[PDB]
Each structure stands twice: as structure tokens, then as C-alpha cells.
Design a protein around this ligand. Structure first.
Ligand SMILES: *[C@@H]1O[C@H](CO)[C@@H](O[C@@H]2O[C@H](CO)[C@@H](O[C@@H]3O[C@H](CO)[C@@H](O)[C@H](O)[C@@H]3O)[C@H](O)[C@H]2NC(C)=O)[C@H](O)[C@H]1NC(C)=O
Ligand SMILES: COc1ccc(C(=O)NCc2cc(C(C)C)no2)cc1OC1CCN(C)CC1
Ligand code: NA
Length: 470
């Protein structure tokens, strides 16, 4: 109620102030005669602390902490079917092991730079379409989820909340660039960590909560929360896991921090330190889900209808932090959830705008452009993309339907091409078109998600080698 609103106002004011202050601090830190790169790659000196904070904050936002508890709470699901915490960590480990050093060693600026140099500028432009939709729909889904969460916590209609959040996210982003985004994520990580880890001890001691050890393997009010994977569901489980594991890498939000580190060796340690952070920040969510599963919602104020019978199972974590915690701590908990839902919007906006500013506007349409023109183009693009994302979140009712399609398209199309450029020699632009056509055809017409990725990958190689033989 009042405590939640007081937390939100303070948190957003602090974030705005830090974002503005970072721009003043770091306006002069860059190549003095190349201002276009200073707002994209950041001057190529970010250490272990700031890098480790921002890389962790990128991957631990969105629906992570609010859908990790829901999977544990809902009967028929459990720890077996909560695959985000393990998918993200394995994706980060694989990235740091195999992809991070080669990309940073060659000193690229954007993810599309490898493609345009070998395949061609036209093919680099064609691969811009799948990425831009993903970056512009992840932000829309995040904005919708934030509105839902805030309308549950307090009563302010979705429009004002989403508009006020999006304006603040865009304002410091266009003013600062990468440095504001990186310096504003330390506050978010500290808020989330402190709130969740101070809330969890108080919830566990409520008289209504039972023993989470006994509930895990024995049924008291509902089915055990460890879960079970049936013999029929093995392949669906593997496909769902592989989507997150092998589809989180080919994103520019990830490659904007791999390419902005001091050296190749410091671009691996950040991934290895973010893999640990993803696991560290997921334990309180699992614990809150287990609490919610073990609780008896008849002595608390929520009333006899259980949250999953009233059809509020997406908001189990706010309900626990509100009803099973004292107000002093509920303040910190609600601030933490509000910080958690908002984490990965600015990174997506900056990632979407940087590629259009560099690869599309500069390198293809207008090569002969000064740095001032490109700076203004980047700022205008940031504003337009933020406005478009907010409008899509508020008006259209098909945000998730398009997010699901774009997520599949990225994993089926972009990932096979990245492997081919980085690790396979002899590839041509005659096989890139074949892969791009074959993946799209199978996705649109008709586990078939992973089989399309292998068909897209294996059609890239055979045609490219065949074209050499003609
Ligand atoms: C949920 O909480 C309620 C309290 O809000 C409790 O319900 C208890 O259930 C007992 C049944 O063992 C009931 O007691 C009976 O009440 C009738 C009148 O309706 C009376 O004629 C009987 O002699 C007997 O006392 C009553 O509904 C209620 N009892 C008390 C003392 O509150 C209980 O804690 C929980 N119930 C469930 C179904 O989860
Ligand atoms: C194929 O790539 C992904 C597939 C699924 C997810 C995922 O988060 N799913 C659960 C979910 C939904 C929601 C709502 C907001 C809609 N919040 O969480 C994320 C994926 O890539 C991200 C990986 C981290 N970073 C690079 C951004 C992209
Ligand atoms: Na961020």
C-alpha cells in the first residue's frame, strides 16, 4: 500500500539521479575524435566490478524471479520444470568458454560486424530483421509485466505506471549511453539482493508455514514441490531446456559487454562471474515458492480461496512478501521485486538502437557522415524505439504471441549463422541464404523447434560447399 509507493518513488528517483550523474562523470572518457563509438562500446575499459554487476543484472531481470517461484508453487510443475536458473548458467558458461575470447580479440563493435565483413552488407542487413524484433518485443513484454506487478502491489492504472517508467528508462539512456546503463545496474542488483535476502528469513518463521523439508517429499496440503518428469515428457523437456541454453547467446545485449572489456581474458571472467550470480539470486525465489506451497492460507489474511484457485499464481512472490512478512521488511521486498521486473529494458533499447545507428545508417546508407550526425541519429533512434515499445505494450494485445515467435526465430536463424562464421571455414554467402530461407520456411509453415535449427545449420554447410563445386 503506502509502503510500496514510498519505495517505488525513492527507487526511481535514485535511478534517475545516478543515470544523469554518470553522463557528467564519463562524457569525456573516450576517443576524443570518435564520439560514435564512445556511446556504443564505451572506450573499451570496464573492469571486473562494474562489468560483473551489469552482466549479472542483464540476465537476472524480466520474468526470472517471478516465474521461478510460480513453477515451484503450481502443482504439476516443480523444481524439475523450472529450467531458467540452470539454462541461463549453462548458456553463460558456454559463451565464456567458446565465444567470448574470439569476438573480443578481433575488436568488433557490434554483433553484426562479423557478418557484414564476410557474407556481405546485404546479408548483414537481412540478419538485422530477426534481432530487432526480438530486442523490441522483449522490452514490450517487460513493460507489460511491470504494469501487471505494480497494479497488483498498489492501485495505479497501467498507463501512468508504464509511461512514467519508460520515460525514465529512455531519458538517462539517451543522455548517457553504455556508461549510464552500467552505472545504474549496481543499484538494482544491491536492491534486489538486500530485499530478497532480508525478506526470506522472516517469512519462514510464520506460524502458518509448515516445514519445507517435509513438504518437499511428502504431501500435506498439495502435491510435493520437487516435481517429476514423466517418460512421455522427456523430449519436450529437452527442447525447452535447449531453447534457453543455446538461444541466450546470439544476442547483442550479451555481446555489448563482452566487446567492452579491457582484454580477452577479462571477457571470460565476467561470464563466469555472471553464471554464479544467476544461481546465487535464484535461491530466495525457490524458497519463497516452497513457502507458498507449504503455507495454509486459512490463518493468514488472504482468506480460504488459495492463490492458485483464485487464479493468481503468477504473483505468488508478491503475495508472500506482503502477507507473510512485517511491514518494515515488506517495504524492502516490494522494492526488490519492482527493481527485478525492470532490469533488462534499457539494455534492450540500447542494443536495438546501436545496430541501426552503426550498421544500417552509417555503413550502408550514408558512409560520408560526421560523428555529430551519427550521435544525433543514435539519440533520435533511442527515443523512437522507446516510444514504439511503450505504445506496443500499452495498446496491442498480442505482445506475448509475437515474443514467442521472435524467440524461436532468433534461436533457429541467428545461432546457426554465428557458429558457421566463427568456427567453420569455407562458408560462403550462397549457404547463408539457404539457411535463412530454410529456417524461416520450417518455422512459419511447420520437438520441431530444435530439428529446424539442425536443418538450418546442415543446409548452410552443404550448399556453401556445393556452390564452390558449382
Ligand atoms: C479454517 O479456519 C476456520 C476458522 O476461520 C476453521 O473452521 C473450523 O472448522 C470446524 C470444523 O472442525 C468448525 O467448527 C464447527 O462449527 C460448527 C458451526 O459451523 C459447530 O456447530 C460445530 O460444533 C463445530 O464447532 C468451524 O467451521 C471452524 N471452527 C472454529 C473454532 O473456527 C478452521 O481452522 C479451518 N477450516 C478448514 C475447513 O480449513
Ligand atoms: C531464446 O531466448 C530466450 C528464451 C526465453 C527467455 C526467458 O526469459 N523466458 C522466461 C520469461 C518470459 C518472461 C516475460 C518477460 C515474457 N520473462 O521470463 C529468455 C531468452 O533470451 C533472453 C536471455 C537473456 N537476455 C539476453 C535477454 C534474452
Ligand atoms: Na541493465
Amino acid at each position: 500500500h503506502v509502503e510500496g509507493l514510498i519505495a517505488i518513488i525513492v527507487f526511481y528517483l535514485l535511478i534517475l539521479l545516478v543515470g544523469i550523474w554518470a553522463a557528467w562523470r564519463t562524457k569525456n572518457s573516450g576517443s576524443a575524435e570518435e564520439r560514435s563509438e564512445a556511446i556504443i562500446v564505451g572506450g573499451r575499459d570496464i573492469g571486473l566490478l562494474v562489468g560483473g554487476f551489469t552482466m549479472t543484472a542483464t540476465w537476472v531481470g524480466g520474468g526470472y524471479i517471478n516465474g521461478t517461484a510460480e513453477a515451484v508453487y503450481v502443482p504439476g510443475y516443480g523444481l524439475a520444470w523450472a529450467q531458467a536458473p540452470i539454462g541461463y548458467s549453462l548458456s553463460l558458461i558456454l559463451g565464456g568458454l567458446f565465444f567470448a575470447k574470439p569476438m573480443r580479440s578481433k575488436g568488433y563493435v557490434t554483433m553484426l560486424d562479423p557478418f557484414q565483413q564476410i557474407y556481405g552488407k546485404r546479408m548483414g542487413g537481412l540478419l538485422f530483421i530477426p534481432a530487432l524484433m526480438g530486442e523490441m518485443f522483449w522490452a514490450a513484454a517487460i513493460f507489460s509485466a511491470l504494469g501487471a506487478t505494480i497494479s497488483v502491489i498498489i492501485d495505479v492504472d497501467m498507463h501512468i505506471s508504464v509511461i512514467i517508467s519508460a520515460l525514465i528508462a529512455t531519458l538517462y539512456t539517451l543522455v548517457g549511453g553504455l556508461y549510464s546503463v552500467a552505472y545504474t545496474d549496481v543499484v538494482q542488483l544491491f536492491c534486489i539482493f538486500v530485499g530478497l535476502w532480508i525478506s526470506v528469513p522472516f517469512a519462514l518463521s510464520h506460524p502458518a508455514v509448515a516445514d519445507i523439508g517435509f513438504t518437499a517429499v511428502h504431501a500435506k496440503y498439495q502435491k510435493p514441490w520437487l516435481g517429476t518428469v514423466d517418460s512421455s515428457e522427456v523430449y519436450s523437456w529437452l527442447d525447452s531446456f535447449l531453447l534457453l541454453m543455446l538461444g541466450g547467446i546470439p544476442w547483442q545485449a550479451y555481446f555489448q559487454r563482452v566487446l567492452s572489456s579491457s582484454s580477452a581474458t577479462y571477457a571470460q571472467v565476467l561470464s563466469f562471474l555472471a553464471a554464479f550470480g544467476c544461481l546465487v539470486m535464484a535461491i530466495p525465489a525457490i524458497l519463497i515458492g516452497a513457502i507458498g506451497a507449504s503455507t495454509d492460507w486459512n490463518q493468514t489474511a488472504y482468506g480460504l480461496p488459495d492463490p492458485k484457485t483464485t487464479e493468481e499464481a503468477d504473483m505468488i512472490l508478491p503475495i508472500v512478501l506482503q502477507y507473510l512478512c512485517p511491514v518494515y521488511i515488506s517495504f524492502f521486498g516490494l522494492g526488490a521485486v519492482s527493481a527485478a521486473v525492470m532490469s533488462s529494458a534499457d539494455s534492450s533499447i540500447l542494443s536495438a538502437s546501436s545496430m541501426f545507428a552503426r550498421n544500417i545508417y552509417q555503413l550502408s546508407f550514408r558512409q560520408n557522415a560526421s560523428d555529430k550526425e551519427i550521435v544525433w541519429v543514435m539519440r533520435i533512434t533511442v527515443f523512437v524505439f522507446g516510444a514504439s515499445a511503450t505504445a506496443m505494450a500499452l495498446l496491442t494485445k498480442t505482445v506475448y504471441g509475437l515474443w514467442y515467435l521472435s524467440s524461436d526465430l532468433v534461436y533457429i536463424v541467428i545461432f546457426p549463422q554465428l557458429l558457421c562464421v566463427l568456427f567453420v571455414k569455407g562458408t560462403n554467402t550462397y549457404g547463408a541464404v539457404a539457411g535463412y530461407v530454410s529456417g524461416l520456411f520450417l518455422r512459419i509453415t511447420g520437438p520441431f523447434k530444435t530439428l529446424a535449427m539442425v536443418t538450418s545449420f546442415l543446409t548452410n554447410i552443404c550448399i556453401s560447399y556445393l556452390a564452390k563445386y558449382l
